[PDB]
Amino acid sequence: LNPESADLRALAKHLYDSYIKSFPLTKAKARAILTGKTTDKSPFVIYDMNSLMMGEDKIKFKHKEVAIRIFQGCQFRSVEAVQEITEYAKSIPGFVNLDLNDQVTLLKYGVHEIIYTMLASLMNKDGVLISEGQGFMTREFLKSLRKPFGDFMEPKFEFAVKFNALELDDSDLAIFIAVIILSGDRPGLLNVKPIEDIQDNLLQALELQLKLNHPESSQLFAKLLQKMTDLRQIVTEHVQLLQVIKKTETDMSLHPLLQEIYKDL
Amino acid sequence: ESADLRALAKHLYDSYIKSFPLTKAKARAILTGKTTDKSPFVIYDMNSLMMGEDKIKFKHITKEVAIRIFQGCQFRSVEAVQEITEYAKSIPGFVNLDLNDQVTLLKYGVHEIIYTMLASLMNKDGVLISEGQGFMTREFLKSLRKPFGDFMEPKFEFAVKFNALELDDSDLAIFIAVIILSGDRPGLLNVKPIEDIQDNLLQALELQLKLNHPESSQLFAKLLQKMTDLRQIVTEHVQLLQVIKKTEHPLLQEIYKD
Numbered sequence: 182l183n184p185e186s187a188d189l190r191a192l193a194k195h196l197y198d199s200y201i202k203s204f205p206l207t208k209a210k211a212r213a214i215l216t217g218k219t220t221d222k223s224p225f226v227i228y229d230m231n232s233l234m235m236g237e238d239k240i241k242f243k244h245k246e247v248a249i250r251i252f253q254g255c256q257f258r259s260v261e262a263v264q265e266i267t268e269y270a271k272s273i274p275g276f277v278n279l280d281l282n283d284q285v286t287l288l289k290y291g292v293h294e295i296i297y298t299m300l301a302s303l304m305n306k307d308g309v310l311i312s313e314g315q316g317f318m319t320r321e322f323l324k325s326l327r328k329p330f331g332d333f334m335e336p337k338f339e340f341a342v343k344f345n346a347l348e349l350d351d352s353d354l355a356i357f358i359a360v361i362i363l364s365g366d367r368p369g370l371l372n373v374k375p376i377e378d379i380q381d382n383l384l385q386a387l388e389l390q391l392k393l394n395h396p397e398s399s400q401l402f403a404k405l406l407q408k409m410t411d412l413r414q415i416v417t418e419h420v421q422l423l424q425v426i427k428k429t430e431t432d433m434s435l436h437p438l439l440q441e442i443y444k445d446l
Numbered sequence: 447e448s449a450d451l452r453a454l455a456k457h458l459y460d461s462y463i464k465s466f467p468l469t470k471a472k473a474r475a476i477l478t479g480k481t482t483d484k485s486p487f488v489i490y491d492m493n494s495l496m497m498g499e500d501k502i503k504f505k506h507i508t509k510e511v512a513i514r515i516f517q518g519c520q521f522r523s524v525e526a527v528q529e530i531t532e533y534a535k536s537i538p539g540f541v542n543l544d545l546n547d548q549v550t551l552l553k554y555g556v557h558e559i560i561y562t563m564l565a566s567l568m569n570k571d572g573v574l575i576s577e578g579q580g581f582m583t584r585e586f587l588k589s590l591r592k593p594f595g596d597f598m599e600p601k602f603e604f605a606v607k608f609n610a611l612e613l614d615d616s617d618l619a620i621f622i623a624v625i626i627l628s629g630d631r632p633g634l635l636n637v638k639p640i641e642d643i644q645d646n647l648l649q650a651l652e653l654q655l656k657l658n659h660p661e662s663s664q665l666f667a668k669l670l671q672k673m674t675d676l677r678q679i680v681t682e683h684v685q686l687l688q689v690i691k692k693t694e695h696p697l698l699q700e701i702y703k704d
């Protein structure tokens with residue numbers, strides 16, 4: 182009972198491998214930090230303006246009002262995430278061989294669904310790890326920021342809490358993330374079929390990977406695919422929120438790379 | 447256990463055939479002409495509608511066209527909700543769930559099922575109407591007023607892609623059941639039995655596809671991702687209904703409260 186299964190495991194290993202090489206902060210590490218293990222250090226916790234302030238010292242993170250400072254923080258980290266995801270996509274067999282326009286298109290629409298997915302790896306009901314895991318910002322501090330900014334994270338936490346319920350590990354994510362990138366239903370693709378063939382193979386690999394890694398958790402495959410609905414809505418609420426800041430913060434600059442992704446859509 | 451899954455599949459199918467008079471198999475027969483017996487009356491332009499309103503009885507008439515057409519789509523939806531409701535009752539486990547959860551699962555699942563089955567009565571040029579007696583063109587629909595001109599366009603968008611999967615009634619019966627037993631509907635009181643049931647339905651669906659479409663074993667996954675396509679359309683629709691909520695009897699408003 183090991184026919185084409187071999188091919189699929191091989192692909193799984195390949196992606197898991199690229200994933201480790203493309204993302205310095207994996208779920209496994211973020212968990213060792215959040216559950217107080219001994220393989221990792223403990224984070225500094227920001228829960229208020231006061232705490233935040235000592236955090237500048239204690240943490241330091243490559244960086245006028247607090248809300249905007251934090252907002253500018255996510256942008257920089259998001260930009261970095263895009264770089265990592267772009268580097269990971271290139272390792273997906275067949276991706277770099279597709280039409281360049283479509284490669285740009287798949288990344289344009291796939292990058293955020295992947296950022297929030299992976300962002301769940303650094304979250305628990307109470308907060309989120311920051312500065313490569315050196316810090317932890319509580320859900321509450323974030324939910325209290327100035328009128329518009331404090332509404333950015335709550336829906337991510339809500340998704341994270343439900344998504345983490347599936348209890349997936351980095352090896353599962355590597356494939357699932359690869360499925361998201363290769364979506365032949367993205368607006369403006371010029372050559373859908375090639376893209377779909379790849380995703381089809383990825384899907385078979387993820388299906389096998391979920392049965393083998395979570396034998397007791399039946400229909401995990403079915404439940405995970407359904408999670409896409411949550412992702413799309415997160416993206417939507419987010420862009421609208423961005424529209425608001427753009428008209429209320431005329432002195433604020435949205436990172437060019439982010440402007441290009443968010444552009445048309 | 448495979449035999450139990452096939453049994454569940456036959457049961458849902460037999461029940462589907464009894465709750466939905468106009469099946470996909472029948473509909474496809476009418477759309478391709480495989481049944482020249484009774485071809486449908488076409489409604490391509492303003493003039494034909496007027497004539498069709500005379501030919502076909504249409505039980506939704508009491509004069510601005512665009513609205514009349516909409517009230518028709520609503521009347522049919524209310525009927526569809528009763529059919530779906532009778533079908534759900536036959537899904538093993540459903541009636542044993544808490545009553546409030548039954549109502550909840552139906553309340554949030556009828557739209558998804560309606561548009562799913564609507565795909566069955568459509569092709570790129572139009573949708574079959576009034577029990578198959580008619581056929582309203584896609585172009586005629588597009589060419590409607592402001593808030594109405596883009597009411598159905600989204601459904602046709604979905605329909606063409608959904609019909610690409612080439613599913614038949616026995617596949618749909620299981621798929622529809624899966625959509626009903628969704629454990630993530632807001633306000634549920636006892637999620638465990640719901641997901642337990644969906645679990646079994648997905649197993650039955652997975653086997654049904656592999657047997658009924660041996661030459662395309664990724665179909666299950668593809669079918670599942672179409673479920674998210676459905677939720678988006680339901681979002682766009684309720685949203686549009688608000689742009690319509692902007693006006694367009696009080697006893698009638700009660701019947702179509704939703």
Ligand SMILES: CCO[C@@H](Cc1ccc(OCCn2c3ccccc3c3ccccc32)cc1)C(=O)O
Nearest residue numbers: 242251252254255256258259310311312313314439
């Ligand atoms: C601000 C615009 O939001 C982004 C999306 C986005 C939103 C929130 C978000 O939360 C993470 C914040 N975040 C930080 C915030 C301040 C300082 C460091 C980090 C940090 C370090 C490592 C990892 C994460 C980190 C990460 C990305 C976009 O629109 O592309």
